[PDB]
Symmetry: C4
Subunit: 355 residues, 4 copies
């Protein structure tokens, strides 16, 4: 008989229970670790996609206290030129900016397997973290590349992904990564589970990996499938240390894509890295568009705002406390229906709730 | 799993009441109940304390029909006092009117954390019950406000919420509330569960809190998420002593606001007190601004709601509410079993007062 | 600390498992029992509603081997008039006709609680079976009416409902019914579960009652919520001796009423008996609606029985009794129901039984 | 209580867990067994449907490593002439163009043909024509008629490979294997155009079906053909991972150049007819299928290419070097409705249409 290992939950299967609280939303700390050695002032990372992060968006992210990861769908020269543009910028309008020993904004940069020349370049341009991202991080090529980079650059922080199992986490942490990115399938533009049948719902994914990663003191980045600030709060409460976000940031002033107008409204194009457009045979992503939403800064303000309200409901003074206090319930579909807005036509724009 | 999953929580659509042997007719069942340890209603419905649901005009009908309205707090003390008095000075056409020892209509009024000056005035205006409402009742701010008010006015009935766990019900009771409001996120216009990830489906919430509050002899008000008369019946069957309703009352004559037209039909604004527009009188809302259909008079709406409650009780075979809770037994259903429970496979021609 | 008795399934939650078959669908027997003393040659009863059954439809149902029930939304004499027309209607064309000992077609008639004078007039008129219906058959009003009727007319077969629990099934059988009707809230036009919060999904409710009423040898009629022919078969495989149908027959020629056109398509009016229009400070438990016009009753019934026979063929059963002994089910997920319907394919030509 | 045997899962109910992988999608081998004795170089069979497979369609599938099955909705001389067109296509240029072609010992493309119950005179004419495998298909394979026909064919033609379906239970698999079949076709209800679960209430969800028959048919060393319900390449992968040895597909191949029938335009878009064999139009009366249309999707070669590409990717995710390793390594999770909505595309309007994702 076939081997079913578990019944796996995603964000919409669970809610956080309220607990006794002596703290206010504005008082809670959202400091967090990005890797074993790098912290963040806010727990959000903009995704390493050509429709999301480039030098401009990586600057806002650091200024607001998180990070952006320059994508790798460009030649070595260009990624160096984008990284240098983040290191040359600077931030009182930005009190929580995420800077380095020289007071320069932190930035990350993506690489593929066996791309040493690119790591060589990014390291000398001053990259703070290298994000080795694959469609399948639990692979011999990725482990080999991890050990080879930690040999050459022992002081360079390295993030590797994407994985979705305790086994994958143990293997990477043993190869010496400084954080693991978790997510096979969750992303809004991802078709992997449909074209290949592979994937693990993200809440169960994060839960499986944090349990293994913690044995190594290795932070877990929850990558993909965030649709609302609440999904962030669920991701952090299960034990992830930071969240990587793409779709919610691509419709902003700061993302690389150009603005255009279709049938009255303004959009930006958003596409998967594994889609046909971005690979120019058998794609695993789609090409789409998202509505224009304004500045990154305002989108980010609402997401963190919801994280803060969540921590106040749970009663947590900081992220680590959040994770000790968190208790969940599993809901049914009808419970999801009641969690959303029901039986009323929305008539004004809500800044943190659309459908 | 290394994450703490406490239970699997059900809401109104996951369950149905099993019919029982019945010796009673729906017209002969008694629907009186308790709002609080010392205030009784003749029927178990309360108006939400919302600036699109309850004001003096709506609060009067609710009292006249046997229930109670809670005047909302989105106004200055002077105005809210004035709203409270219009109801008290209102005073065979309404034979189930819910009155006080002097024979004035009963009325409620909402308050927030540490608004002690607001309470001083509302007591002097003769309010019967002060509703200490907050997004998160299970907090030091609310506990301390409870103990403070119960120290200053030991005979003023206090309601506090909203909660959704036994631990919370326990805290408020020992702080001395006379009734708890249960409901974190079921509201039609609520986005709490989405914007913050916090919530408990309402049926598991009620059930959990009633069990705890009963130990203290404290009634439970089921707040929000009620879509049809049947939910009012489910909610009471689980242990709630009364139900508070928003969107089903916002489209009426007696709610504040004015009617407006959109593509041939008439509507009324309806919005969360956590919405941008309501709060503006930078913000991270937990509500939305919407409209609902104009549905005529509150009286028509309360008639149908209580009508289906009386129908339910007849099916269960219960003479009064407290018997309805002892006899009631539930069936949990699947999603497809609800497709069958609504109307299905047939196009509706004429509208039904009780069903849209 | 609330009382959740079980998890209740409806038709869409189950499927029949195939079995070894030595039988072909043309050659399986679909006779059954309506009551303790009245048999049917096919297991279908047309519903007792003012938009479904009247004499024109009851005559057809009996000619094809089933039975119609004349609805109670009319004065006594007018109901007497309808039953008499069915009775006096009276071999190669309709070989499977369901007749009484006098060669006349069989007919039922619906009555309400406490309506003894109507019963007398119907017994006088030759009604084979009286169907005493209520929103809540498990009440003192209905039990006392059963006891009274059975006392005055012992040899008159009586049906009572609707009910949805074992305990209710026991009470009706002890009061002397000759059948029970199961169905609280599965009806296509029924809003009971929304208005009162009261119901039991049909497959679980049939299961619970059938077990109980077999102890007395009382057939169970499965009432309401039949959408397709496969639900006919699921209803009987679980234990029901017959099934009652409303929506699938309201859009026929014999259904009482006249057709009307809305947006270039033809329709029949179809309404619940607890709707505002069937009654006229009232609190309805049904809606007023319309169903597409689907032609003759004979064409609809032929497909319905044709899916029952085929189902028997899959399970491998010579008759309904064998069908119930062999039937095994699987429970499916909402996803498994999408796959069991047509998916991914626009349907160009509409099917007769889909 | 009514006898409820289990809770049965369909494809959308499960996902494969990735494992440690040392293989690349392009290096994994996808060869598989069709019957106890006939091999395939790819695991896809085109369905025995009068709008899916005929000689043109059968040829292209053999060229790519798979197999076609010529439908039986035609007279015997018609079916024999179409079986021959495949066998003639190559005798012994197009061997370097289709290097993975599925050939017999004579070098001709392999071909299947469908028969109904008690059609021995059809079988005779098909065997003389050079058919490689005869598939005895029925709405209900677990029946006396199918099993006696299986006995009669294997007695008259001992060395002729025979597939028999459709079944959905271990008991049925046990019966057919014991009657001496060489493969079983699993599938009651899952087909895109089928209405058997709706009209007759009968059927088993396809993942559980495959799982129940594989466990039994393996005891006899007999392969399972997972037949119907495939809407995406990932379904092929799941069906194989559960233990099926090959997959039969109708809907995804009916809108192709090779498919029988002709193109037509309806509101400025091009479609092909695609109907269930139990539909009213297909039976020249209580149907068990409907008559539909499918978007035109160009050549069978490009369709097959994406489908196999998805499978290879799935294999790379699991780390498996061949289909046997895929099955010994595979582990699943069960998912909820919200997990399936997460697994698809969500919140983004698909502007460009992907060659392997259409909703
Ligand atoms: C986020 C997604 C899905 C995405 C992003 C960009 C592109 C892609 C595309 C659409 C190209 N798909 C994959 O590339 N699919 C894939 C599937 C299974 C495996 Cl095993 C592998 N190979 C892994 O094994 C090697 C180590 O040995 C690694 O280099 C890596 O290639 C790849 C997908
Ligand atoms: C009905 C809802 C949801 C609503 C209505 C109007 C406005 C609101 C707003 C949108 C303002 N949201 C909250 O206020 N969210 C909130 C979340 C967590 C916490 Cl812990 C707190 N703080 C609590 O602390 C004090 C006691 O300690 C209480 O006053 C309360 O402030 C507030 C929401
Ligand atoms: C098919 C349905 C649902 C329907 C059809 C037409 C009309 C109705 C109406 C809308 C009238 N609803 C009921 O009548 N609801 C009801 C609910 C609970 C109880 Cl307890 C009772 N009382 C029963 O007790 C007496 C026998 O004991 C009966 O006369 C009856 O009155 C009635 C409903
Ligand atoms: C793929 C489907 C569903 C299909 C394809 C073409 C046509 C059909 C039709 C629409 C004609 N329906 C059936 O034929 N329904 C059926 C149902 C139950 C049983 Cl038991 C049987 N009998 C089977 O057992 C005998 C053993 O020898 C066989 O001859 C065979 O007749 C048939 C359906
Ligand atoms: O095309 C691809 N296929 C599958 N996943 C992708 C692809 N491109 C990016 N991703 C992942 O999807 C994430 C974005 O998910 P989203 O924020 O939910 O839209 C990124 O952080 C990547 O990890
Ligand atoms: O905007 C807000 N955010 C969340 N909940 C709210 C907000 N405003 C009102 N509520 C709650 O929603 C209830 C109304 O629910 P309704 O009956 O579904 O419309 C009120 O009784 C309040 O407890
Ligand atoms: O007005 C009503 N309210 C609730 N149930 C009804 C009403 N009228 C008829 N019914 C039931 O619904 C059944 C028909 O349902 P259908 O076969 O699904 O259309 C009838 O046989 C009655 O048992
Ligand atoms: O008319 C029919 N009724 C039920 N199943 C059918 C019918 N015609 C073909 N099938 C089956 O459905 C399969 C096609 O499924 P598809 O791949 O989802 O379109 C074929 O392989 C047959 O086994
Ligand atoms: K809500
Ligand atoms: K219904
Ligand atoms: K189907
Ligand atoms: K996805």
């Amino acid at each position: 008989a076939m081997k079913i290992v578990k019944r796996a939950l995603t964000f919409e299967d669970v809610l956080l229970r309220p607990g006794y609280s002596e703290v206010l939303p504005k008082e809670v700390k959202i400091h967090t670790k990005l890797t074993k050695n790098i912290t963040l002032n806010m727990p959000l990372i903009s995704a390493a996609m050509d429709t999301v992060t480039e030098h401009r968006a990586a600057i806002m992210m650091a200024r607001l206290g998180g990070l952006g990861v320059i994508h790798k769908n460009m030649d070595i020269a260009s990624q160096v030129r984008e990284v240098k543009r983040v290191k040359k910028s600077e931030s009182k309008e930005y009190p929580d900016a995420n800077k380095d020993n020289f007071g320069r904004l932190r930035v990350g940069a993506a690489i593929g397997v066996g791309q040493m020349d690119r790591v060589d370049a990014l390291v000398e341009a001053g990259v703070d973290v290298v994000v080795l991202d694959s469609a399948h991080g639990h692979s011999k090529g990725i482990i080999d590349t991890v050990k080879a980079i930690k040999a050459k650059y022992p002081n360079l922080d390295l993030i590797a992904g994407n994985i979705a199992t305790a086994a994958a986490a143990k293997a990477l942490c043993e190869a010496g990564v400084d954080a693991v990115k978790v997510g096979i399938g969750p992303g809004s533009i991802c078709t992997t589970r449909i074209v290949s049948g592979v994937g693990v719902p993200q809440i169960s994914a994060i839960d499986e990996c944090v349990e293994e990663a913690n044995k190594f003191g290795v932070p877990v980045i929850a990558d993909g499938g965030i649709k609302y600030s609440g999904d962030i709060a669920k991701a952090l409460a299960v034990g992830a240390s930071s969240v990587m976000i793409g779709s919610l940031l691509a419709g902003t002033d700061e993302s690389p894509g150009e603005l255009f107008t279709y049938q009255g409204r303004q959009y930006k194009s958003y596409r998967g890295m594994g889609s046909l457009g971005a690979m120019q045979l058998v794609p695993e992503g789609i090409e789409g568009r998202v509505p224009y939403v304004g500045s990154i800064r305002s989108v980010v303000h609402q997401l963190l705002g919801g994280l803060r309200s969540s921590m106040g409901y749970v009663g947590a003074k900081d992220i680590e406390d959040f994770q000790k206090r968190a208790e969940f319930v599993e809901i049914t579909t009808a419970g999801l229906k009641e969690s959303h807005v029901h039986d009323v036509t929305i008539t004004h724009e809500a800044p943190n709730y659309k459908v």
